[PDB]
Amino acid sequence: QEIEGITNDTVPKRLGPKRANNIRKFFGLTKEDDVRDYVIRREVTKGDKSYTKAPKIQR
RNA sequence: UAUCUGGUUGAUCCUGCCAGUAGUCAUAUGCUUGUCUCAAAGAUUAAGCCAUGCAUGUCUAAGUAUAAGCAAUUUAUACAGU
Ligand SMILES: [Mg+2]
Ligand SMILES: [Mg+2]
Ligand SMILES: [Mg+2]
Ligand SMILES: [Mg+2]
Ligand SMILES: [Mg+2]
Ligand SMILES: [Mg+2]
């Protein structure tokens, strides 16, 4: 028996990987593939203006 | 910038203290008090107690920002502005 929303509904991860190695771990890409391509960008709205926030991929 | 006088007796000269005397960046306290300038101030009694508040935090082009923070527009879909 699934309890209301604890097992039924899911809350996603707040953050994505910050380190390049960590990023690689998240997908499984190997050295050649590079970063940039698979970064979790957040898109925030003030009210009318919609803008973007992206992680600084250290290392 | 080294100063003495009153008090022992009927008077005397002393020895002596006592009293005055002058000061204190030494306290208190009493009246009093308009003015500038400079300003000590719970040491002394109990290093006794303590309500409340404050008395140490710090960021630069240059350690760490996906603030679901602000910004917002004529460097971005890697970051690059506070
Ligand atoms: Mg770096
Ligand atoms: Mg005699
Ligand atoms: Mg006489
Ligand atoms: Mg005297
Ligand atoms: Mg005047
Ligand atoms: Mg005391």
How close is the Cα of A26 to the center of ligand 4, in Å?
101
Question: Resolution (in Å) of the shown entry?
Answer: 3.8
Q: Closest nucleotide (CA of A56 to C1')? A: B79
Tokens of A11: 């809350």
Contact A43, A50 (CB under 8 A): yes
Displacement of CA A18 from its chain's centroid (Å): 9
Q: Which nucleotides of B are covered by protein (CB under 7 A)?
A: 64-68, 70-73, 76-81
SS (H, E, C) chain A: CCCCCCCCCCCCCCCCCCCHHHHHHHHCCCHHHCCCCCCCCEEEECCCCEEEECCCCCC
